[PDB]
Nucleic acid binder design. Structure first.
Length: 148
RNA sequence: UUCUGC
């Protein structure tokens, strides 16, 4: 229990309007595409930012990821379906868990990474954003250019 | 718990 614990009741009532979530304990061989597909099982079209950092030296990710949901209620959908479940049906070790992210909001996450050096590694390792509203909601958006 | 030290 800390300032980043996710409480569903206070999300539903509007007490906590944070939208960015840290996904924990990801097996290090997951790719960004696999994570996107994993989330889309229950939350397709409900988020507009996804980043799973890939350590290019190894063949592994850092074990966690950050996702910005468009509406806070979508956290309840993802959490109630995935929290406590195994990342791999053959291994009890890695269990999906969530908490609030320390950087909140699509705008802040864009500003964090648009000038970052990871934007010039392979696109498979880059943060991704998606259309937040309208008929194109959920489609991938070009990341804004560096502004520094 | 994200990083042009990270």
């Amino acid at each position: 229990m800390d300032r980043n614990s996710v409480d569903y009741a206070q999300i539903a009532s509007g007490i906590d309007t944070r939208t960015t979530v840290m996904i924990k304990n990801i097996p290090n061989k997951f790719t960004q595409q696999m994570l996107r597909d994993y989330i889309d099982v229950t939350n397709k079209g409900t988020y507009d930012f996804l980043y799973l950092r890939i350590d290019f030296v190894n063949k592994c990710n850092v074990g966690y990821a950050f996702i910005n949901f468009i509406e806070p209620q979508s956290i309840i959908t993802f959490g109630k379906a995935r929290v406590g479940t195994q990342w791999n049906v053959f291994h009890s070790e890695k269990i999906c868990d969530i908490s609030y992210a320390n950087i909140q909001g699509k705008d802040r996450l864009i500003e964090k990474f648009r000038n970052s050096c990871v934007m010039d590694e392979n696109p498979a390792y880059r943060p991704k954003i998606f259309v937040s509203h309208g008929p194109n909601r959920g489609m991938e958006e070009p990341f804004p250019a560096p502004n520094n």
